[PDB]
Structure 1
Amino acid sequence: DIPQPIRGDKGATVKIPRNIERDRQNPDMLVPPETDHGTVSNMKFSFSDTHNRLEKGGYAREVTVRELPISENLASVNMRLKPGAIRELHWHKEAEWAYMIYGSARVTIVDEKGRSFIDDVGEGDLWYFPSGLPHSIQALEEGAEFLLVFDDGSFSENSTFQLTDWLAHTPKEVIAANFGVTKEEISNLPGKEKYIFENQLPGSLKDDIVEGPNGEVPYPFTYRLLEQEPIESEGGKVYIADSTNFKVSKTIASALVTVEPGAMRELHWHPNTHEWQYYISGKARMTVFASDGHARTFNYQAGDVGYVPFAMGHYVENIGDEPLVFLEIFKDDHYADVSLNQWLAMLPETFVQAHLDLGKDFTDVLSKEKHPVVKKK
C-alpha cells in the first residue's frame, strides 16, 4: 500500500511527487513516535547512496564525514575483491579495522621493526592495522567482501599512499640509488597506481610465511571474533573485541550484535565515546535521546551506517522477521555500556520508585545482571 505521514489526528497525506520506496523503508521517520521531539542531526546513511568505484578485480564505496557529518571521527569503506584480486600494498595515517562479511582474504602487514605478519581471514574475522603500517589484501577462491572502518571521519580510500604511486612519483635515479640497481633494471615500473587489480590465486598460507632476522610480531593483527564465547541473553548475542582481548586494536573497540525477531538491544548508553554502526542484515529502528527533551527515531536496514553521539540514550529494536545483525564501533581502547535496567536494579527500590512514580511491581522486575539483548514477552 501507500503509507501516509498521519498519526491519529496529526499529519496529512502527501500531495506532491514523492519517493514511496524510501518512505516504505522509513516508517518511523514518515510517521515518528509521538515521543520524538526537537532538532537532532541525521544519524543514518546508506552505502547504496554512494558512488561505487569499479576496478578490474572489484569495487569500493565509502561513507565519510562528507556523507554523514555527525561522524567526524570515523569513516567506512565497503570493499569487494574477486578471487585472487589484490588491494595494492599501501598505507595511511588512519588506523584501520575490518570485519569480513563474505568470503576470505590474505592480509600482509610489516611493522616499523621490519617484522611481517601474513594471515588468512574468513567470515566473522577481524583485522586491525595500526596507523601508518603498510598492508595489503588479496581475496582467496571465494572472493571477499568486507567492511573497513578508519579512525578519522575525513578519510577517503582514494587518498591512500600506494606503493606504485610512490615510485611513479620518485625520480628514477633516486629509486635506482635506493636499491643499488640501474635505471634500465626498473624501466618497467608502472607509471601510475594499480589500486585494485586481478591476479592469480595465491598458494597455501604456510608457503607465503616470510622469515626474517627481526623476529615475530608480538601481537597478531587478526582476530577470530565469531569463535569467541558471546554474551548470550534471551533475545540474542553480543561478541566484543577491544584492546583488552584483540590486543593490537588500540583505537577501535567493536561489538557484533545479533537480535532475534521480537528482540531488542536494550536501553543503554556508552559512557566513553560515540557509537558508529553498520547494519549487516535485517531491519531496525532506534531512538536516540539527546538530552533536554530531544529525541529522534531512525530506521536502518542492510547497507546502512548509523551513529549515536557520546552518551546519548538508545535502543535498537528488530522490526523485521529475520535476525538483525549489526556492528557497534567506538574510537577507544575499550567497549563500555551502562544498562538502564541494571543501573536502576542496583539502586534502593524506594529511591527508584520516587523518581518513576511507579511501585514495587515495577522495581521487582529489574535485574542486577546486564542482558544486552532482551526478548519481548
Structure 2
Amino acid sequence: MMYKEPFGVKVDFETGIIEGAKKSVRRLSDMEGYFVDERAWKELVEKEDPVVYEVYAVEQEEKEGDLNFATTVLYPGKVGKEFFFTKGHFHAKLDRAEVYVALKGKGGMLLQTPEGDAKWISMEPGTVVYVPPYWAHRTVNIGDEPFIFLAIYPADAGHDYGTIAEKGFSKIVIEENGEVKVVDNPRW
C-alpha cells in the first residue's frame, strides 16, 4: 500500500500564516448581498474595498476519514454597524463537524441549522469551538485587530455557500452605542 507522508508545519499564532498553504483572499466587493446596510457596503467598497479575510489552507484530497486544516485571518471592520464576518457555509456533506481554535483577537461564531435557528458562541484566544454536524457557521470579528483562528475539518466536508448567500443568518452582530449586540436580522 502507498502511504502519504507525515509532515509538520509552523503556524504563527500571531499572524495566522502557514508557509506552503493555499492562500485565499476575500475582499468586501466579493461579499455583495451579505451585509444589512447595502449603501454602506457600496460606499466602503468604492472608497477602499478592504480585505475582509484571508485563509491559509492545508488540504488533502476529498477522502473520508482524512483531515484538512486552515487558518483564517478575519480583519477588523464594520459595514455600517455590522462587524466584518466570513461568508458562512454549510458543509457539502452536511453531517461533517468542525473544530475551531481561536488564536488571536476577539470574535465569535454564528451558527444556524437548516431550519434557521441560530446561536452565538464568543471566541477569545484559547476558545475551542465545536461546530456540530448540520450547523452552518460564520465567524465574526467584534474587535479592533485581526481575529485569527485555526479550523480543523473532515477532508470530504466541502463547502456550501449558496443558501447563506441569499438569506444570510437569522441573527446579525452589530455595534450600537459602543456595545456589541447580537440581534435579530431584520432582512431574514
* Same fold, TM-score > 0.5, yes or no: yes
Looking at both structures, which has the greater relative contact order when contacts are Cα pairs under 8 Å and sequence separation is at least 6?
2
Q: Is 1:134 paired with 2:126?
A: no
Q: Which has the larger radius of gyration?
A: 1
Matched residue, 1:97: 99
Matched residue, 2:120: 118
Percent of matched pairs sharing the same residue: 15
Deviation sequence 1:81-112 (CA, Å, 0-9, x none): 00032101321132111000111212211235
Tell me if the contact between 2:22 and 2:58 (Cα under 8 Å) persists in the aligned partners: no
Q: Is 1:145 paired with 2:148?
A: yes
CA distance in 2, matches of 1:90, 1:126: 19
Matched residue, 1:86: 85
Change (3 A) 1:163 1:106: farther
Q: Compute the displacement of 1:48 (Å).
A: 0.9
Matched residue, 1:299: none
Matched residue, 2:69: 76
Matched residue, 2:19: 48
Change (3 A) 1:40 1:58: same
User: What secondary structure, in the 3-state scheme, does the structure 1 residue paired with 2:141 have?
Assistant: strand
Q: Compute the displacement of 1:166 (Å).
A: 5.7
CA distance in 1, matches of 2:140, 2:117: 19
Task: In structure 2, give the amino acid aligned to 1:136.
Answer: R
Tell me if the contact between 2:113 and 2:134 (Cα under 8 Å) persists in the aligned partners: no
Q: Is 1:62 paired with 2:57?
A: yes
User: What secondary structure, in the 3-state scheme, does the structure 2 residue paired with 1:89 have?
Assistant: coil
Q: Compute the displacement of 1:138 (Å).
A: 1.2
Deviation sequence 1:240-293 (CA, Å, 0-9, x none): xxxxxxxxxxxxxxxxxxxxxxxxxxxxxxxxxxxxxxxxxxxxxxxxxxxxxx
TM-score by length of 1: 0.31
Task: In structure 2, give the amino acid aligned to 1:133.
Answer: W
CA distance in 2, matches of 1:62, 1:126: 19
CA distance in 1, matches of 2:182, 2:119: 10
* Count of aligned positions: 134
Tell me if the contact between 2:174 and 2:183 (Cα under 8 Å) persists in the aligned partners: no
* Contiguous gaps of at least 5 residues in structure 2: 10-17, 28-51, 78-83, 168-172
Deviation sequence 1:208-259 (CA, Å, 0-9, x none): 145xxxxxxxxxxxxxxxxxxxxxxxxxxxxxxxxxxxxxxxxxxxxxxxxx
From 165, 177, 182, the counterpart of 1:208: 182
User: What secondary structure, in the 3-state scheme, does the structure 1 residue paired with 2:57 have?
Assistant: strand
Structure with bigger helix share is: 1
TM-score by length of 2: 0.59
CA distance in 1, matches of 2:53, 2:118: 26
Tell me if the contact between 2:53 and 2:86 (Cα under 8 Å) persists in the aligned partners: no
User: What secondary structure, in the 3-state scheme, does the structure 1 residue paired with 2:22 have?
Assistant: coil
User: What secondary structure, in the 3-state scheme, does the structure 1 residue paired with 2:88 have?
Assistant: strand
* Contiguous gaps of at least 5 residues in structure 1: 1-38, 168-188, 190-200, 211-377
User: What secondary structure, in the 3-state scheme, does the structure 2 residue paired with 1:76 have?
Assistant: strand
Tell me if the contact between 1:105 and 1:143 (Cα under 8 Å) persists in the aligned partners: no
Change (3 A) 1:165 1:127: closer
Tell me if the contact between 1:102 and 1:145 (Cα under 8 Å) persists in the aligned partners: yes
Output aligned runs, 1:34-45, within 5 Å. 41-45=4-8
Deviation sequence 1:60-92 (CA, Å, 0-9, x none): 12112249x9x9422111111000321013211
User: What secondary structure, in the 3-state scheme, does the structure 1 residue paired with 2:19 have?
Assistant: helix
